Amino acid sequence: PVQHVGGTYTHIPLSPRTLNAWVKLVQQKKFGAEVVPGFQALSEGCTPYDINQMLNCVGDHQAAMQIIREIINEEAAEWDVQHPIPGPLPAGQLREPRGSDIAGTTSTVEEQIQWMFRPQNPVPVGNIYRRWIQIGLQKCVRMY
Amino acid sequence: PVQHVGGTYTHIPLSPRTLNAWVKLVEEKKFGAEVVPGFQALSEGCTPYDINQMLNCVGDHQAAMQIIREIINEEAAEWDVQHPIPGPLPAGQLREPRGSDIAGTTSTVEEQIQWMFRPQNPVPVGNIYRRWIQIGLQKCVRMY
């Protein structure tokens, strides 16, 4: 998640108990329907980096992880079609997020927070990524 | 929770993150099944005092709270039947916990910690209470 202290936005990790509640859903509910609402709830306010921490326990269940990854790739690819880069990037300027930046594969949590909380035209990359994961989890539920 | 720093166990509250995650979990579907494993993880290592904070954070769900209260009262009464007293308790000495002590009604957090961590027959009052709350939450899930 993101804290706002000295007028600055910075990362704060999911508490161990919060992450452990997710981990316990994932291990206990074998990708039954409530993984969906559980993810929604527990991913509230998350950055992509945080979501990627939540997906660490999902990597223990490759069947599910494969399903989810395929959906992430699809959604990232469509994002990029819908957001063509006009370029080139001005010196020193943070790029607009690509699909892989939203997924947190190519971005730092500091970049993520900048997109989320910058003063002009923020991009809610955590919430966009959470939608992608929800699509994937819904598919896991219908395929397990 | 409880911390142990140089020979003294003391209370540390659940983080605001953790408590807010619990709230989100409860309200995603309004006591969807996900609350049961989630509560287990979120309340790990808690005192009754901490569990009561969790409950007060969802106290606007009065229907659920009444269902949980009835179960607490049942379990507390059966705990008291199962533990007739008998002492002797010296004037310098913490009583053995009763049902209302386990529930955090008639006990302070310092008393709870004393029972949980004393070396002479500790009583895991937090875990006992957690068991009661689980029964109540399972009932909430079915009755909502």
- The CATH number assigned to the domain holding A62 equals 1.10.375.10
For residue A43, give its domain range: 1-144
Give the gap in angstroms from C-alpha B81 to the nearest C-alpha of chain A.
34
Tell me, yes or no, if A57 comes closer than 8 A to chain B by beta carbon.
no
Alpha-carbon span B39 to B110, nearest angstrom = 23
Tell me, yes or no, if B18 comes closer than 8 A to chain A by beta carbon.
yes
Give the gap in angstroms from C-alpha A129 to the nearest C-alpha of chain B.
18
Give the gap in angstroms from C-alpha B89 to the nearest C-alpha of chain A.
37
> Do residues B11 and B113 lie in contact, with contact meaning Cβ atoms separated by under 8 Å?
yes
Nearest to B18 by CA among A22, A18, A19, A13: A18
- Who contacts B102 (Cβ-Cβ below 8 Å, separation ≥6)? B48, B76, B79, B125, B128, B129, B132
Tell me, yes or no, if A55 comes closer than 8 A to chain B by beta carbon.
no
Tell me, yes or no, if A25 comes closer than 8 A to chain B by beta carbon.
yes
Tell me, yes or no, if B14 comes closer than 8 A to chain A by beta carbon.
yes
Alpha-carbon span B130 to B54, nearest angstrom = 11
Alpha-carbon span A38 to A55, nearest angstrom = 13
Count up the domains in chain A and report the number.
Answer: 1
Task: Mark yes or no for CB contact A29/B34 under 8 Å.
Answer: yes
Resolution in A: 1.2
Q: How far is CA B103 from CA B45, B71, B83, in A?
A: 15, 11, 15
Strands (DSSP E) along chain A, which ranges? 2-4, 9-11
Report the run of H or E that residue B39 belongs to, with start and end: helix B35-42
Alpha-carbon span A2 to A116, nearest angstrom = 10
